[PDB]
Design goal:
The first copy, chain A, is built from nine helices and no strands. With about 180 residues, chain A is mainly alpha-helical. The N and C termini of chain A lie far apart (about 55 Å). In chain A, about 70% of the residues lie in helices and about 0% in strands. Chain A has helices spanning about 5-40, 45-75, 80-85, 90-100, 110-120, 130-135, 140-145, 155-170, 175-180. The interface between A and B is small, with 3 and 4 residues. Chains A, B: This is IST1 homolog. Chains A, B: Belongs to the IST1 family. Chains A, B: Keywords: Cell cycle, Cell division, Cytoplasm, Cytoplasmic vesicle, Cytoskeleton, Nucleus, Phosphoprotein.
Chain lengths: ~180, ~180
């Protein structure tokens, strides 16, 4: 385990997350316009897939915001990392989430895997790849939900479509079966 | 939706309606003289068509007067448009009629279509081209009658011919079938 390596990788992860959330917000605007165009036509069951894409990306942007927050938290309390040998309570959440989410966002942010390494190679109490996955039952549940790979609720998709239609001056008749239940 | 655009288009519509009603009154005088000349001869069933033209134009001039009134009303209560988000009762009639009559008089007055746009793009409660046509059941009935595209009543045509003949010193024998029923 190297400390300065972890510091540099944390700063890089922060910068990368900033860039990614910016450009993802922009792409989300453009793809929302695309969904509005799709709704202009009679194609409806396809706009639901497109808006699934959109809300997945939005969950992802929120999760990246949370991860940037946690990385900056670790970077603000780095000396408290170097001094102690076991992490305190103030850093349990950050370390846990940054180790749990690394394989999730490993493709988007590469440096995050190095951060996970330095945070797994520094600890031995329930640590190590195997024990690091075993002791991952203390991560932020909200971030787990944002990065949860699951079909979003249908009613949520209908609400997303209703709002986009209402904004882009396009008519849309929600599926009452899901819109009312 | 742009406010100053709506203001300017309303002023332009007012001016255009003034010019149009003036010149239409003049043309109506001249065409009434033409109908008198037609009645001087034995041609009668043709003077009825000409006077149909005339009374259509007169309905149109009255409708343009009403529309000028409503545009000026909106222009006098423009701040009340900008402040609220939903139109009040004092402006329901003006907005409704100016949205309903725009496609009717779109050829005569072009700016009226822009006014209709700004008044449809500002509202969402039963608004939008489709919902704007659906919620058009609150317009001034009188203006609807003036701009009603229908064969005028025959007795009314006979009365118009009787008056024109009596004024231009020409004999005319009304159709008793319609003149008495």
């Amino acid at each position: 385990f190297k400390a300065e390596r972890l510091r540099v990788n944390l700063r890089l992860v922060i910068n990368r997350l900033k860039l990614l959330e910016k450009k993802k917000t922009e792409l989300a605007q453009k793809a929302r316009k695309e969904i509005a165009d799709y709704l202009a036509a009679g194609k409806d069951e396809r706009a639901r897939i497109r808006v699934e894409h959109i809300i997945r990306e939005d969950y992802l942007v929120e999760a990246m915001e949370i991860l940037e927050l946690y990385c900056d938290l670790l970077l603000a309390r780095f000396g408290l990392i170097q001094s102690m040998k076991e992490l305190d309570s103030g850093l349990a959440e950050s370390v846990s989430t940054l180790i749990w989410a690394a394989p999730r966002l490993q493709s988007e942010v590469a440096e995050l895997k190095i951060v996970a390494d330095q945070l797994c190679a520094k600890y031995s109490k329930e640590y190590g790849k195997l024990c690091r996955t075993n002791q991952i039952g203390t991560v932020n549940d909200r971030l787990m939900h944002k990065l949860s790979v699951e079909a979003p609720p249908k009613i949520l998709v209908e609400r997303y479509l209703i709002e986009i239609a209402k904004n882009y001056n396009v008519p849309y008749e929600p599926d009452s079966v899901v819109m009312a239940e």
